[PDB]
Amino acid sequence: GYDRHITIFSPEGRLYQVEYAFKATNQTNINSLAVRGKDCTVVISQKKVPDKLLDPTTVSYIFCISRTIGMVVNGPIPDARNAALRAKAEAAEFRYKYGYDMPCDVLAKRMANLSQIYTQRAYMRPLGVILTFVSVDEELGPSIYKTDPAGYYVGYKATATGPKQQEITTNLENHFKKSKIDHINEESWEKVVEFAITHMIDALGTEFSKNDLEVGVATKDKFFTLSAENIEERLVAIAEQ
C-alpha cells in the first residue's frame, strides 16, 4: 500500500496524500470567513491563544502578501508561512516583470498551479493548507479566491473555511438567498466587518471578545489587518443594536 504514502493513483483513481493534506487543514481548529462589500473585501478568522506564555501579537494566520492582496490560511503555521513567503515573492516578481500589481486571482492561480505540482511530482509533499486570497482588484472589484492542497482554485462571492465551515457556509448562503445579490450592500468597510462578525457569531453560536478575533480588510490600493482595539470598537457597535 505505497499508493497511500506518495502522490500516485490508488486503484480507485484517488490521491490519498492529497486527501490527508486536506485533513491537516483543520488541525488548528480555526474557522475563517470571507465576504465582499461594495468597496471592500473583509476576511475574519478565529484567534486562539491557548498558552499564557505566548505573545498574542505574534499569533496570526492572516498575511499581507502585497499592499493590495491579503491572505488568510487554514492549516498549520509552518506550511502557512511557506505559502505566505512564496506568495509574497511571486507578487513582487510579478510587479517587477510586468509593471503592475499582481491581481488576486492571478496569484491564486499561480499558487494553485504550484500546489498541483506537488500532487503530480513524488518527491514534494502537498502543503496542508487552504489559502483564501482577498483584494479589491482594480479591474474585477472586490475579490475572494481560494486555493487548496489539490491545486484547485475558484472565485467566491463569499466563503468559509475550517472545521465548522458547513455551518458558516449555509448561514451565508441563506443571507444571499434573501438579499439576491453577490455582496454586502454597504458603503463603509466598518459595517461589512460588523456583518462578517455578526454572521459568524450566529453560525458558530459563540460570543467573541476583542482577543478571540482577527480581522483583515481589503480596500482599493491597500489591505490591512485590524488591531484589538479596532475590533473592540466593531464589537461595541454590534452589541449596541
Partner: protein, 243 residues
C-alpha cells in the same frame, strides 16, 4: 500503516509522524529556557555533568548569532549547531544586502522556513531540536521558540527539554505576578531558579548552570554570557530558593 517510516508523508490523521518522533528526541534532551524582560531577553540551560572529567565552563551550549541574537536548544546538540550555522549565514546575507542587523522576527522566519523545508522531502530528516532564541532589535526585545515542524511563536517565557512542564509552571507565575514587567537582572536570577527547579526531572546527575542575556541597558543590545560575580549571584539566589 507505514506512514511513520518516511519523512514528509501524511498519515490518515493529517500528521507527519517523523516530525512527532523528532519531538521525542527534543523531550529526551536537557532543560533550556528563555525569559523576555523589560528591554531584552535572558537564556539559560541545564548542562548535565555526566562525569567529573568534564572541564567546568568549557562545553558551552548557548550560541550567538550575529552580535545581538542568542540561541539555545534542547535535543540533538549537533542538529542545533547545524541550525545556528544556517542562521549565521542568513543573518550575514541580510546584513550584507540591507546594512542593518537582522531583526528578530525576520531572523525567526529564516530559521522557521529552513526547519520547515526539512519536513517537505523523504531524503532529509527533521531537526531533533526545539530552539529558544531572541534578542534586541530596533522594535525592542523579542523571544521565540522553534519546533521540529517549523512552528514558532513569540513568547513572554519559553521552555523545552525534559524539565519543560516544571519550567513552564514557573514561567507562568512570573507572567502573572509581574504584569508591568521584569528587569534584566531580575530575569537572570529567575532563569537560574527555574533551571534549578526544572533539574528535579534530571535529578540523578548533578548539573552546571549556563546563562546568557541581551538587554538594551545592561549589555547595549548585544548578546553576552553571564560570567563571574553575576553568575555566582544568580546561583546563590537559585540555591536559596530550592532550600
Amino acid at each position: 500503516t507505514g506512514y511513520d517510516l518516511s519523512n514528509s508523508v501524511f498519515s490518515p490523521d493529517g500528521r507527519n509522524f517523523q516530525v512527532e518522533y523528532a519531538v521525542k528526541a527534543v523531550e529526551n534532551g536537557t532543560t533550556s529556557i528563555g525569559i523576555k524582560c523589560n528591554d531584552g531577553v535572558v537564556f539559560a540551560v541545564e548542562k548535565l555533568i555526566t562525569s567529573k572529567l568534564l572541564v567546568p565552563q568549557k562545553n558551552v551550549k548557548i550560541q550567538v548569532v550575529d552580535r545581538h541574537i542568542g540561541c539555545v536548544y534542547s535535543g540533538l546538540i549537533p542538529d542545533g549547531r547545524h541550525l545556528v550555522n544556517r542562521g549565521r549565514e542568513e543573518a550575514a546575507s541580510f546584513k550584507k544586502l540591507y546594512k542593518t542587523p537582522i531583526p528578530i522576527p525576520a531572523f525567526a522566519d529564516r530559521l522557521g522556513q529552513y526547519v520547515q523545508a526539512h519536513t517537505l522531502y523523504n531524503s532529509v530528516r527533521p531537526f531533533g531540536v526545539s530552539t529558544i532564541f531572541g534578542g534586541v532589535d530596533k522594535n525592542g526585545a523579542h523571544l521565540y521558540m522553534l519546533e521540529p515542524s517549523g512552528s514558532y511563536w513569540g513568547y513572554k517565557g519559553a521552555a523545552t527539554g525534559k524539565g519543560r512542564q516544571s519550567a513552564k509552571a514557573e514561567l507562568e507565575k512570573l507572567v502573572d505576578h509581574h504584569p508591568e514587567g521584569l528587569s534584566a537582572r531580575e530575569a537572570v536570577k529567575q532563569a537560574a531558579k527555574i533551571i534549578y527547579l526544572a533539574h528535579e526531572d534530571n535529578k540523578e546527575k548533578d548539573f552546571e548552570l549556563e546563562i546568557s542575556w541581551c538587554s538594551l541597558s545592561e549589555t547595549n543590545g548585544l548578546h553576552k554570557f553571564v560570567k563571574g560575580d553575576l553568575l555566582q549571584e544568580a546561583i546563590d539566589f537559585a540555591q536559596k530558593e530550592i532550600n
